[PDB]
Amino acid sequence: TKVSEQGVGELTASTPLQEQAIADALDGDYRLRSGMKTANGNVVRFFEVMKGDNVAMVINGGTISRIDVLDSDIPADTGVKIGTPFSDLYSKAFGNCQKAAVECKAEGSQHISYQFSGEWRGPEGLMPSDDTLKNWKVSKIIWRR
Structure with a gap:
């Protein structure tokens, strides 16, 4: 699993923002949590992909439009990783x-x-x-x- 122009592993712009779609896309020993927040005069859903006690990714979207990666085990395909100077x-x-x-x-x-x-x-x-x-x-x- 890497961050690339197309997404994070099999998480892409065409991935629905839905529990089972994300879990099917995920490749790791993760748990999944959800939440909602306010955006552009409405409420949007988000998911936190959990790696033990800690957030490994935040997925926003109602299709995926942003993924923040905090899991040090997932590098960018540019070669950049958590911790790069x-x-x-x-x-x-x-x-x-x-x-x-x-x-x-x-x-x-x-x-x-x-x-x-x-x-x-x-x-x-x-x-x-x-x-x-x-x-x-x-x-x-x-x-x-």
Whole structure:
């Protein structure tokens, strides 16, 4: 299982946002939980794919339109994984990255982004500088349809 342009394993833009569809798509020893939230003047459903006590993925959609991956065992097919150092991927934040954690588009991808976390430095309403960020690490991989 990897994050790719098409989704996460067999979870894709055509995957219904439904318990049995997701469970059939999933390839691992996961549990599944659900929830609802507010979006665009309505209420939408989401699923949390659970790996033990911890969220491995959040699936949003009523068909899947976003998957946040927190499971360190699922890399991006760009080779990026949870824990990848910022400085492995980017020489600077400018234009690549924005406050989500900081979120950056994967180079050459239309669908994949990485969120980074690390020690915050400076004012809270801006992206931290390049010298702080160099030591940040990937804390989430995000796919969007």
